[PDB]
């Protein structure tokens, strides 16, 4: 086993049906239908001496925490004490030895001709390499291309409620800090269920859905604790993240750095609250809604959201924010 060629992991039927959706420093994102269900494929370069896309290759023991936290966050959606379906499930992980097949290369070329990419052409890579394959379940369209597609303010309220509830269960269960909620990292999926079930510490509750479901992805820079041991990544020696400008998302990194005195190994749940603040900032300024604001009740909820935005920062944690702020009662 181990480094098998991509033929076994990806048979011809799935290769011809791959559409390429996203990109990043990590690697590639592909979409295909397998077992009569659309599944997401993420493939990354591993254990190479070469330099690609402005960074050298990553090494295996540094990518192990990624899969550990992914499989741990996947499993909690079945636990009886604390449960929610706000995460993406793990299907399979393997290792691939070889080069890049031409079909998905032409698919990337199609994407580049349509919208474009900021990375290099992955055609120089030889047979002797290794690769990593990630199978995730389809989430939908992220918030970044859905700016002109939301229904009204009630949908926004439900979105914030679902995000806050999911993070609350995450913290109450596994003491989680994910730290990278930029608005291109939340997934929306159409649904028919009218209400959602979430239980924290053995007490159940229900949330209106308005026909949408929310999930979180891209946990490459998260922290977790389990059975006295702590899993995370130390980023205290690379400062290009804290030199950003032009957006509040660039500022929040330096803000949490100020908060945690440059100690990434501590549990500071307040860090998530600033991310919720940032998300609320986008929902009030960088959004356009189909429906106007004429109905008095929707004016009321608009005032509620404004007060929530301006008075969240006095609050301690996500769970306390869930059980204390006036929005959710």
């Amino acid at each position: 086993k181990g480094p098998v060629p991509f033929s076994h992991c990806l048979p011809t039927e799935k290769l011809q049906r791959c559409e390429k959706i996203g990109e990043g420093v990590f690697g590639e994102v592909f979409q295909t239908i397998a077992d009569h269900t659309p599944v997401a494929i993420k493939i990354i370069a591993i254990e190479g001496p070469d330099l690609v896309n402005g960074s050298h290759q990553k090494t295996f023991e540094e990518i192990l925490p990624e899969i550990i936290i992914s499989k741990e966050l996947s499993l909690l959606s079945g636990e009886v004490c604390n449960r929610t379906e706000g995460f993406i499930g793990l299907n399979s992980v393997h290792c691939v030895q070889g080069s890049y097949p031409p079909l998905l290369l032409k698919a990337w070329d199609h994407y580049n001709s349509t919208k474009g990419s900021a990375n290099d052409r992955p055609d120089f890579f030889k047979d002797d390499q290794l690769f990593i394959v990630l199978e995730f379940e389809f989430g939908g369209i992220d918030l970044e291309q859905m700016r002109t597609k939301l229904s009204s303010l009630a949908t926004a309220k439900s979105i914030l409620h679902q995000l806050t509830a999911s993070l609350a269960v995450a913290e109450a269960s596994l003491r989680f800090e994910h730290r990278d909620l930029h608005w291109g990292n939340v997934l929306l999926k159409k649904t028919s269920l009218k209400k959602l079930h979430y239980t924290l510490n053995g007490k159940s509750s229900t949330i209106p859905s308005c026909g949408l479901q929310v999930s979180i992805i891209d946990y490459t820079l998260s922290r977790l604790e389990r059975d006295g041991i702590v899993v995370f990544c130390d980023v205290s020696m690379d400062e290009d993240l804290f030199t950003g400008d032009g957006d509040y998302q660039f500022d929040i990194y330096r803000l949490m750095k100020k908060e945690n005195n440059n100690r990434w190994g501590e549990y500071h749940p307040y860090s998530n609250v600033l991310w919720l603040h940032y998300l609320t900032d986008k929902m009030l300024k960088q959004m356009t809604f189909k429906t106007k604001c004429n109905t008095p009740a929707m004016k009321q909820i608009k005032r509620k959201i404004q007060e929530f935005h301006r008075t969240m920062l006095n609050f301690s944690s996500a769970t306390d924010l869930l059980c204390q702020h006036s929005l959710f009662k």
Binding site: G24, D180, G184, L221, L241, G244
Partner: peptide, 4 residues
């Protein structure tokens, strides 16, 4: 993204 994470890095500008």
């Amino acid at each position: 993204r994470t890095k500008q």
